[PDB]
């Protein structure tokens with residue numbers, strides 16, 4: 001039984017669509033495929049679902065792009081559904097609009113800018129090689145538990161100066177943030193609240209130990225950037241360090257799983273990457289277009305008409321980022337990976353002032369991953385009749401990816 005809410009007075013019947021972001025219709029065929037079902041040739045640009053507390057969904061890439069770019073009309077004061085979860089959410093600076101957002105983003109960019117990220121290449125490669133070597137001679141692995149959930153977590157915990165043994169407990173908090181348990185808006189709100197508190201509890205001693213510290217880790221570097229001529233306050237520090245961990249640990253893990261399932265079903269594409277190493281390097285952005293993972297929201301600042309649709313102040317609009325990169329109005333044959341695609345425009349990293357601060361790190365992890373994978377395991381396929389298990393929510397997830405190959 002799905003929890004359902006009545007449409008408010010300003011939502012007309014013809015825009016209503018029953019869409020469950022946390023359990024998409026057709027999800028067993030894939031996350032991307034399930035979102036694609038919503039984007040039909042005649043579907044309105046904005047549709048309203050009675051599920052997950054009642055909210056709008058942007059169904060086309062240009063609205064998604066525009067909403068992300070327009071913080072004055074669509075605020076980050078609530079970026080989750082259901083509303084209860086969005087109100088419990090306390091991460092920084094992702095809860096803030098400009099101008100409050102901008103000193104915190106500048107602080108993060110001190111640690112995460114492209115020139116900083118470039119320095120990490122060989123440490124990332126070393127981690128990738130060590131994991132791949134554990135199974136490359138074997139001719140099979142379950143890619144999810146043996147690589148995708150291992151590689152990005154080891155990379156991030158090392159960068160953040162944290163013990164790898166914390167991976168499990170941080171992964172559990174991350175799940176309840178992005179895929180909160182519950183069958184009610186209030187239950188999901190409560191699950192997110194508990195996860196968010198868990199992050200704060202974990203992060204507090206690290207902030208206390210690393211304020212003015214001399215560690216060269218990511219957390220010490222960012223935490224000690226002044227905000228408006230002063231040390232960053234405790235409340236903001238909790239939200240900020242928690243965000244670093246959430247962003248570092250959930251995203252690349254899930255991205256890698258979707259990407260790899262597709263590659264394992266497209267040997268011709270894998271072979272191109274092998275024959276032309278520059279096609280691989282240059283084609284990574286195409287993979288980001290193709291394997292979006294985030295579906296999050298914005299809060300309507302005032303009563304307005306937007307793309308022919310009446311919106312009320314306080315309305316939540318969900319932005320399924322897959323519906324930008326996979327929009328057939330933005331990209332021909334959008335479900336196909338074309339490494340030579342000249343136009344890869346997407347919102348996988350969102351847009352506007354919150355456009356992913358970790359995007360350089362994400363690109364490098366993936367580039368390194370594919371380079372070291374193809375070096376040791378040039379050819380591979382998904383196990384015959386294997387059925388990956390898919391999850392939808394604010395961040396998509398996938399498990400059960402059994403790969404097979406002839407040891408080279």
Ligand code: HEM
Pocket residue numbers: 076079092093094105108243244245247248249251252253255292293294296297321347348349350353354355356357358359361362
């Ligand atoms: C597959 C890779 C990734 C994807 C698809 C992704 C996606 C996104 C998206 C969509 C946003 C915008 C959220 C919003 O305002 O609604 C975001 C922001 C952010 N991400 Fe990433 N992310 C990824 C990797 C990472 C990594 C590895 C980090 C490292 C910690 C990271 C750190 C951040 C931070 C700190 C923000 C907030 C930026 C701000 O508010 O100015 N992300 N990410």
Ligand SMILES: CC1(C)[C@@H]2CC[C@@]1(C)C(=O)C2
Pocket residue numbers: 091094178246247248250251294296394395
């Ligand atoms: C949606 C995100 C990927 C972005 C960074 C981590 C994440 C889950 C957030 O809370 C904001």
